[PDB]
């Protein structure tokens, strides 16, 4: 298939967190997925993510290196890189 895959590396997966480094080449996509845990995103590169909602509507979100944000369990989205730059962020999922 033509869709380019997002790359992931799990850096930590202990009793507190699962930390995954995500790298999205230009023209890649995570595919739609569902979040089962609250999480923090730490962007490692400046960029522009495309977020596709379950209904197909689309939004762009700016990532700024070192500017973290928090999200709750239940988020459902496809994250795509429609930009010319590799997107890089760490996702820190918050375990119980």
Query: What does DSSP say about strands 28-29 and 47-52: parallel, antiparallel, or unpaired?
Result: unpaired
Q: Which is nearer to Ca ion, 32 or 95 (CB)?
A: 95
SS3 52: strand
Based on the shown chain and the rule CB under 5 A, indicate whether residue 71 belongs to the binding site for Ca ion: no
Would you say 51 and 59 are in contact if contact means Cβ atoms under 8 Å apart? Answer: yes
Q: Which of 3, 59, 68, 76 is the binder for a copy of itself (CB under 8 A)?
A: 68
Q: Which is nearer to a copy of itself, 38 or 48 (CB)?
A: 38
15 is in an annotated binding site: yes
Q: How many CB atoms lie within 10 A of CB 29?
A: 17
Based on the shown chain and the rule CB under 8 A, indicate whether residue 76 belongs to the binding site for a copy of itself: no
Q: Which of 4, 21, 23, 38 is the binder for Ca ion (CB under 5 A)?
A: 38
93 is in an annotated binding site: no
Q: How many CB atoms lie within 10 A of CB 41?
A: 17
């Amino acid at each position: 298939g033509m869709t380019v895959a997002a790359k992931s590396e799990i850096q930590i997966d202990n009793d507190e967190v699962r930390v995954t480094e995500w790298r999205l080449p230009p023209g890649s996509a995570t595919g739609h997925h569902t979040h089962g845990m609250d999480y923090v995103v730490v962007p490692m590169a400046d960029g522009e993510m495309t977020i596709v909602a379950p209904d197909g509507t689309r939004s762009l979100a700016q990532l700024k290196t070192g500017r973290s944000y928090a999200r709750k369990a239940g988020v459902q989205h496809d994250v795509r890189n429609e930009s010319t730059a590799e997107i890089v962020f760490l996702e820190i999922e918050l375990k119980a």
